[PDB]
Design an enzyme around this catalytic site. Structure first.
Site, PDB file in Angstrom:
ATOM      1  N   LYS A 254     -11.057   0.470   0.819  1.00  0.00           N
ATOM      2  CA  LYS A 254      -9.789   0.025   0.312  1.00  0.00           C
ATOM      3  C   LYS A 254      -9.001  -0.716   1.377  1.00  0.00           C
ATOM      4  O   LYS A 254      -8.880  -0.212   2.473  1.00  0.00           O
ATOM      5  CB  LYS A 254      -9.020   1.249  -0.092  1.00  0.00           C
ATOM      6  CG  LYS A 254      -7.609   0.982  -0.537  1.00  0.00           C
ATOM      7  CD  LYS A 254      -7.318   0.153  -1.806  1.00  0.00           C
ATOM      8  CE  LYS A 254      -5.909  -0.431  -1.978  1.00  0.00           C
ATOM      9  NZ  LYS A 254      -5.678  -1.240  -3.318  1.00  0.00           N
TER      10      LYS A 254
ATOM     11  N   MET B 220      -1.206  -2.211  -8.164  1.00  0.00           N
ATOM     12  CA  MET B 220      -1.334  -0.924  -7.522  1.00  0.00           C
ATOM     13  C   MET B 220      -0.327  -0.705  -6.430  1.00  0.00           C
ATOM     14  O   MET B 220       0.049   0.461  -6.237  1.00  0.00           O
ATOM     15  CB  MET B 220      -2.730  -0.798  -6.947  1.00  0.00           C
ATOM     16  CG  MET B 220      -3.947  -0.877  -7.839  1.00  0.00           C
ATOM     17  SD  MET B 220      -3.959   0.290  -9.170  1.00  0.00           S
ATOM     18  CE  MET B 220      -4.310   1.768  -8.317  1.00  0.00           C
TER      19      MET B 220
ATOM     20  N   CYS C  43      -2.295 -10.446   1.232  1.00  0.00           N
ATOM     21  CA  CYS C  43      -1.202  -9.651   1.680  1.00  0.00           C
ATOM     22  C   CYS C  43       0.119 -10.461   1.432  1.00  0.00           C
ATOM     23  O   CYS C  43       0.155 -11.665   1.442  1.00  0.00           O
ATOM     24  CB  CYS C  43      -1.340  -9.283   3.148  1.00  0.00           C
ATOM     25  SG  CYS C  43      -1.921 -10.660   4.191  1.00  0.00           S
TER      26      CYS C  43
ATOM     27  N   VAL D  52     -13.400 -14.100  -5.630  1.00  0.00           N
ATOM     28  CA  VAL D  52     -11.966 -14.153  -5.540  1.00  0.00           C
ATOM     29  C   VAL D  52     -11.327 -12.765  -5.697  1.00  0.00           C
ATOM     30  O   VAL D  52     -11.887 -11.860  -6.347  1.00  0.00           O
ATOM     31  CB  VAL D  52     -11.308 -15.096  -6.600  1.00  0.00           C
ATOM     32  CG1 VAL D  52     -11.768 -16.505  -6.364  1.00  0.00           C
ATOM     33  CG2 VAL D  52     -11.718 -14.651  -8.032  1.00  0.00           C
ATOM     34  N   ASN D  53     -10.132 -12.666  -5.170  1.00  0.00           N
ATOM     35  CA  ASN D  53      -9.156 -11.643  -5.579  1.00  0.00           C
ATOM     36  C   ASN D  53      -8.675 -11.852  -7.034  1.00  0.00           C
ATOM     37  O   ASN D  53      -9.096 -12.835  -7.682  1.00  0.00           O
ATOM     38  CB  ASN D  53      -7.978 -11.598  -4.570  1.00  0.00           C
ATOM     39  CG  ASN D  53      -7.459 -10.202  -4.318  1.00  0.00           C
ATOM     40  OD1 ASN D  53      -7.262  -9.432  -5.243  1.00  0.00           O
ATOM     41  ND2 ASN D  53      -7.294  -9.845  -3.030  1.00  0.00           N
TER      42      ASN D  53
ATOM     43  N   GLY E 232     -15.635 -11.383  -9.157  1.00  0.00           N
ATOM     44  CA  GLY E 232     -14.855 -11.632 -10.354  1.00  0.00           C
ATOM     45  C   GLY E 232     -15.696 -11.746 -11.606  1.00  0.00           C
ATOM     46  O   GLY E 232     -16.551 -12.612 -11.704  1.00  0.00           O
ATOM     47  N   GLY E 233     -15.344 -10.898 -12.552  1.00  0.00           N
ATOM     48  CA  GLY E 233     -16.039 -10.976 -13.838  1.00  0.00           C
ATOM     49  C   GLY E 233     -17.444 -10.513 -13.935  1.00  0.00           C
ATOM     50  O   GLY E 233     -18.124 -10.895 -14.879  1.00  0.00           O
TER      51      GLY E 233
HETATM   52  C1  LIG Z   1      -7.393  -1.146  -9.073  1.00  0.00           C
HETATM   53  C2  LIG Z   1      -7.731  -2.397  -8.227  1.00  0.00           C
HETATM   54  C3  LIG Z   1      -7.435  -2.346  -6.881  1.00  0.00           C
HETATM   55  C4  LIG Z   1      -7.640  -3.478  -6.042  1.00  0.00           C
HETATM   56  N1  LIG Z   1      -7.390  -3.416  -4.730  1.00  0.00           N
HETATM   57  C5  LIG Z   1      -7.733  -4.412  -3.918  1.00  0.00           C
HETATM   58  C6  LIG Z   1      -7.662  -4.274  -2.473  1.00  0.00           C
HETATM   59  O1  LIG Z   1      -7.203  -3.230  -2.001  1.00  0.00           O
HETATM   60  N2  LIG Z   1      -8.125  -5.304  -1.744  1.00  0.00           N
HETATM   61  C7  LIG Z   1      -8.619  -6.455  -2.287  1.00  0.00           C
HETATM   62  O2  LIG Z   1      -9.127  -7.314  -1.538  1.00  0.00           O
HETATM   63  N3  LIG Z   1      -8.764  -6.631  -3.605  1.00  0.00           N
HETATM   64  C8  LIG Z   1      -8.371  -5.633  -4.421  1.00  0.00           C
HETATM   65  N4  LIG Z   1      -8.571  -5.722  -5.772  1.00  0.00           N
HETATM   66  C9  LIG Z   1      -9.234  -6.912  -6.274  1.00  0.00           C
HETATM   67  C10 LIG Z   1     -10.691  -6.773  -6.503  1.00  0.00           C
HETATM   68  O3  LIG Z   1     -11.307  -6.549  -5.213  1.00  0.00           O
HETATM   69  C11 LIG Z   1     -11.358  -7.987  -7.139  1.00  0.00           C
HETATM   70  O4  LIG Z   1     -11.103  -9.090  -6.252  1.00  0.00           O
HETATM   71  C12 LIG Z   1     -10.707  -8.336  -8.501  1.00  0.00           C
HETATM   72  O5  LIG Z   1     -10.525  -7.131  -9.291  1.00  0.00           O
HETATM   73  C13 LIG Z   1     -11.678  -9.277  -9.235  1.00  0.00           C
HETATM   74  O6  LIG Z   1     -12.945  -8.735  -9.523  1.00  0.00           O
HETATM   75  P1  LIG Z   1     -13.363  -8.096 -10.947  1.00  0.00           P
HETATM   76  O7  LIG Z   1     -13.233  -9.198 -11.959  1.00  0.00           O
HETATM   77  O8  LIG Z   1     -14.754  -7.563 -10.743  1.00  0.00           O
HETATM   78  O9  LIG Z   1     -12.349  -6.988 -11.205  1.00  0.00           O
HETATM   79  C14 LIG Z   1      -8.308  -4.647  -6.629  1.00  0.00           C
HETATM   80  C15 LIG Z   1      -8.617  -4.670  -7.969  1.00  0.00           C
HETATM   81  C16 LIG Z   1      -8.378  -3.561  -8.763  1.00  0.00           C
HETATM   82  C17 LIG Z   1      -8.716  -3.640 -10.188  1.00  0.00           C
HETATM   83  C1  LIG Z   2       1.043  -5.227  -5.616  1.00  0.00           C
HETATM   84  O1  LIG Z   2       1.743  -4.761  -4.404  1.00  0.00           O
HETATM   85  C2  LIG Z   2       1.314  -4.877  -3.065  1.00  0.00           C
HETATM   86  C3  LIG Z   2       2.012  -4.363  -1.965  1.00  0.00           C
HETATM   87  C4  LIG Z   2       1.636  -4.404  -0.691  1.00  0.00           C
HETATM   88  C5  LIG Z   2       0.432  -5.030  -0.382  1.00  0.00           C
HETATM   89  C6  LIG Z   2      -0.003  -5.132   0.963  1.00  0.00           C
HETATM   90  C7  LIG Z   2      -1.180  -5.791   1.339  1.00  0.00           C
HETATM   91  C8  LIG Z   2      -1.943  -6.304   0.226  1.00  0.00           C
HETATM   92  C9  LIG Z   2      -1.558  -6.247  -1.134  1.00  0.00           C
HETATM   93  C10 LIG Z   2      -2.453  -6.783  -2.229  1.00  0.00           C
HETATM   94  C11 LIG Z   2      -3.428  -5.582  -2.604  1.00  0.00           C
HETATM   95  C12 LIG Z   2      -4.106  -5.807  -3.841  1.00  0.00           C
HETATM   96  C13 LIG Z   2      -3.842  -5.111  -4.945  1.00  0.00           C
HETATM   97  C14 LIG Z   2      -2.846  -3.976  -4.988  1.00  0.00           C
HETATM   98  O2  LIG Z   2      -3.069  -2.948  -4.344  1.00  0.00           O
HETATM   99  O3  LIG Z   2      -1.995  -4.115  -5.855  1.00  0.00           O
HETATM  100  N1  LIG Z   2      -4.496  -5.364  -6.192  1.00  0.00           N
HETATM  101  C15 LIG Z   2      -5.391  -6.424  -6.310  1.00  0.00           C
HETATM  102  O4  LIG Z   2      -5.883  -6.729  -7.386  1.00  0.00           O
HETATM  103  N2  LIG Z   2      -5.689  -7.127  -5.148  1.00  0.00           N
HETATM  104  C16 LIG Z   2      -5.116  -6.821  -3.885  1.00  0.00           C
HETATM  105  O5  LIG Z   2      -5.478  -7.503  -2.905  1.00  0.00           O
HETATM  106  C17 LIG Z   2      -0.313  -5.573  -1.465  1.00  0.00           C
HETATM  107  C18 LIG Z   2       0.123  -5.525  -2.771  1.00  0.00           C
END
Ligand SMILES: Cc1cc2nc3c(=O)[nH]c(=O)nc-3n(C[C@H](O)[C@H](O)[C@H](O)COP(=O)(O)O)c2cc1C
Ligand SMILES: COc1ccc2cccc(CCc3c(C(=O)O)[nH]c(=O)[nH]c3=O)c2c1
Ligand SMILES: Cc1cc2nc3c(=O)[nH]c(=O)nc-3n(C[C@H](O)[C@H](O)[C@H](O)COP(=O)(O)O)c2cc1C
Ligand SMILES: COc1ccc2cccc(CCc3c(C(=O)O)[nH]c(=O)[nH]c3=O)c2c1
Lengths: 313, 313
Positions: B44, B70, B131, B194-195, B250-251
């Protein structure tokens, strides 16, 4: 009961219309949209001169939506103006004309000619701001300085209420900046959210190939893929632009989807990919479905729920 | 026929791993991912200090994908670093550690302390450039000057190969600029595209309500919604960054979706929403499904087809 409503000094039978670029390029298309049950129509975004657009295949659809790189094929502004001035039957429904010139100057030139026809006939302008920009810059609506220039010039040249068609945004700061630009222009009376989600890439596993020819297969996305994006943009601008109307576009396939756009803030609801796929009979279905959801909920008007999406706590 | 990869001076049984944030937050989560059939795992995204994250509900999933806000709940850097240095069994698979500080200083301090553990144990850094920076400004990777500052500072502080997790982009000018920033940094050896597609809005038609509590229901989208956007980003960066690896995210719900990512250019393939919904069993299914497509096509290794998507003429 009935879904009729009044906006921009016009009366509409219902909130549905085509999305620009779908079923709106030729005289045949426009007559077909006018014959439909839609509450309004919009013409294909035009340039001063006709364009052939990009090589085919340039649109494809799938269960979850569509991809396109049409390249703005269009019959040129003189045609669309003629359609607005001489051919459209205003007694049937309102007409919106969409313009997307390749520079600020071309836009200004088109809107100076449109103004008198807007006065005379009541055609309404939708300015498509996902148009090309100067070298190295993104599409005009992703450049906020370019966006302000375009609106300043068009507002002065046109001098009448108009709307703008926006690409989607994905960042709250961008919502704030974009809405602030738009709110500098009192003549901007509606904001249509959204254009396609830019530069997606659909790949066929069997052939190992992209599915459209231009731009190495990259194109804008529409349809089911984009509904939560669309909703977010509608609501973000509804919140930010209280003295404007918001028109929703993106991912509408059912009256339930329309209902969500309206809860988000939509006045009119535009239909692109699902209309391209199903044809103009979709308008009767959408109306029936929307009236059915209203009836089950006890809503007798659109105004009773427009913009009334609930938040938690 | 085999799914094996050798990259970044590690060996991977297969290309599948979790996406950061999913099944990665606690020791229990990490041991679970370790025990799974995935080829790797990522922890995470962390901050120096533990965070509780946003109020619930803050994730929801639906047939077409997920939305989340989140708020970066996590156990803090020292926890993840301890996991990497003392707890992880490297004999099972490689480990990536994701960081996402709230300032460049916070990221610099983490990577200074990560370095010796990276060197000794081989943990790989993924820097999350979604971030937030300054509130009212876009996320870091949508602010190219900020992105460059973060990468210059982290590169100087860390001094070892690392990767970056990128948000999606939607405009060719942005692909070009982003990739050019990345290509300034030789230590950036992988780019994960991607994110989540930012700031979507899911609305429940029955309750007339948003479905997550933070940010008035706005959150990042994952899942089926975003596959073509993901593919586009993978391929755009694969074309633009010839000296770097691209990891796809993604996806992905099937071996076919993974196959498409790999055609686009992906090395490792990350799984977020589908993993959160199905659990870690999904990895054996994905591996079987991908091997079945390879057998049908006569492909023996992933390099046979990685980045080999065909374009039309
Ligand atoms: C509950 C949740 C938490 C996530 N937390 C992060 C994170 O901490 N760091 C990050 O790089 N991406 C985070 N993501 C993004 C995922 O790593 C991924 O990029 C995004 O969900 C797209 O992929 P998917 O279509 O397989 O869900 C999060 C996604 C979900 C659903
Ligand atoms: C939604 O609120 C915040 C607050 C603080 C954060 C600090 C570093 C990265 C992030 C983005 C973390 C993240 C989140 C998240 O934890 O919300 N969810 C994703 O789908 N991708 C992500 O990269 C932060 C997001
Ligand atoms: C084939 C095609 C052509 C389009 N051409 C235009 C156009 O000329 N002007 C414009 O504003 N949008 C154009 N669009 C975008 C649509 O108006 C609409 O914003 C997008 O398709 C999203 O709606 P949907 O999900 O209902 O398809 C086009 C879309 C398609 C699919
Ligand atoms: C993709 O190639 C070009 C080329 C010239 C353009 C000129 C103005 C507007 C546009 C955007 C037109 C448009 C198109 C299109 O005709 O490709 N498709 C969309 O989904 N939305 C649109 O707004 C142009 C697009």
């Amino acid at each position: 009961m009935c879904l009729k409503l009044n906006l921009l000094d016009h009366v509409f039978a219902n909130p549905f219309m085509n999305a620009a670029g779908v079923l709106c390029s030729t005289e045949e298309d426009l007559r077909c949209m006018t014959a439909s049950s839609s509450g309004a129509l919009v013409s294909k975004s035009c340039t001063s001169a006709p364009r052939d657009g990009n090589p085919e295949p340039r649109y494809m659809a799938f269960p979850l939506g569509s991809i396109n790189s049409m390249g703005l094929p269009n019959l040129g502004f003189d045609f669309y103006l003629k359609y607005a001035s001489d051919l459209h039957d205003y007694s049937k429904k309102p007409l919106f004309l969409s313009i997307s010139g390749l520079s600020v100057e071309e836009n200004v030139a088109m809107v100076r000619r449109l103004a008198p026809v807007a006065q005379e006939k009541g055609v309404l302008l939708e300015l498509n701001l996902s148009c090309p920009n100067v070298p190295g810059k993104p599409q005009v609506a992703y450049d906020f300085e370019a966006m302000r220039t375009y609106l300043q010039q068009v507002s002065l040249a046109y001098g009448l209420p108009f709307g703008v068609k926006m690409p989607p945004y994905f960042d709250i700061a961008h919502f704030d900046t974009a809405a602030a630009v738009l709110n500098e222009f009192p003549l901007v009376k509606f904001v249509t959210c959204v254009n396609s989600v830019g530069n997606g890439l659909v790949i066929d596993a069997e052939s190992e190939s992209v599915v459209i020819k231009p731009k190495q297969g990259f194109g804008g996305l529409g349809g089911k893929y984009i509904l939560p994006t669309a909703l977010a943009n509608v609501n973000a601008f509804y919140r930010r632009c209280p003295d404007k109307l918001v028109f929703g576009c993106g991912g509408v396939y059912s009256g339930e989807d329309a209902f969500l756009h309206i809860l988000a803030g939509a006045s009119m609801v535009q239909v692109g990919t699902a209309l391209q796929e199903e044809g103009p009979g979709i308008f009767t279905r959408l109306e029936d479905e929307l009236l059915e959801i209203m009836a089950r909920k006890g809503y007798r008007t659109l105004e009773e729920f427009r913009g009334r999406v609930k938040t938690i706590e």
